[PDB]
Recover the amino acids of this structure.
């Protein structure tokens, strides 16, 4: 039940972006889900700060929060978008749209 | 009430590291606290994925979690630690120990 990449299919209409994104209608964004708690998994690539904070959280759970399972690497997708001239234009690498890797931070 | 760096003073004894860290006894680790919710602040440097996920969370709050306020840059501290030869040694830049910057991820 540890920090990992899971599916997350996003509809641009649902998030109000269909005003400018023509296509695609949906994409696989993924998400990072799971706990950052001891014992850790081999590949959650935990920073020292995440480790320290997790230990502090254990000792003081009402005052300090645990580390968070977040994207640590993102990948691009292509989008067809409306130009200011009102013309569909391809944005070939629209960066930061999809999770490549997750970790505790 | 947005994502930012706040104080977090860590005692190494409290987290079980006084077995190997001789000094210092405590340090300022900081932590990242606050919400990742619209409207965003100017300097939470949000990735596109964090923005998309936050919007999906709004539409589907029981199924998708919000973005997380995490460290996006860390700084070193110096520690005096016990060597395998049982001798105090300085580790001048012990990396990743203190928060330099926070953001939504
Ligand atoms: Cl562990
Ligand atoms: Cl680190
Ligand atoms: Cl491009
Ligand atoms: Cl290419
Ligand atoms: Cl881009
Ligand atoms: Cl905003
Ligand atoms: Cl981005
Ligand atoms: Cl060093
Ligand atoms: Cl130096
Ligand atoms: Cl180091
Ligand atoms: Na997957
Ligand atoms: Na959606
Ligand atoms: Na507490
Ligand atoms: Na290519
Ligand atoms: Na501060
Ligand atoms: Na402490
Ligand atoms: Na829901
Ligand atoms: Na120096």
């Amino acid at each position: 039940s540890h920090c990992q990449k899971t599916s997350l299919r996003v509809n641009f209409e649902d998030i109000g972006w269909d005003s400018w994104i023509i296509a695609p209608k949906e994409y696989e964004a993924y998400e990072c889900r799971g706990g950052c708690f001891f014992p850790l998994a081999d590949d959650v690539t935990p920073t020292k700060h995440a480790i320290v904070q997790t230990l502090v959280h254990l000792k003081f759970p009402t005052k300090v929060s645990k580390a968070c399972c977040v994207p640590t690497k993102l990948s691009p997708i292509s989008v067809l978008y409306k130009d200011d001239m009102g013309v569909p234009t391809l944005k070939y690498h629209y960066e930061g749209m999809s999770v490549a890797e997750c970790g505790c931070r």
Q: What stands out?
A: The first helix of chain A runs from residue 48 to 59. The CA atoms of residues 8 and 30 of chain A lie 4 Å apart. Helices of chain A lie at 48-59. Residues 4-104 of chain A form a domain with the Cystine Knot Cytokines, subunit B fold (CATH 2.10.90.10).
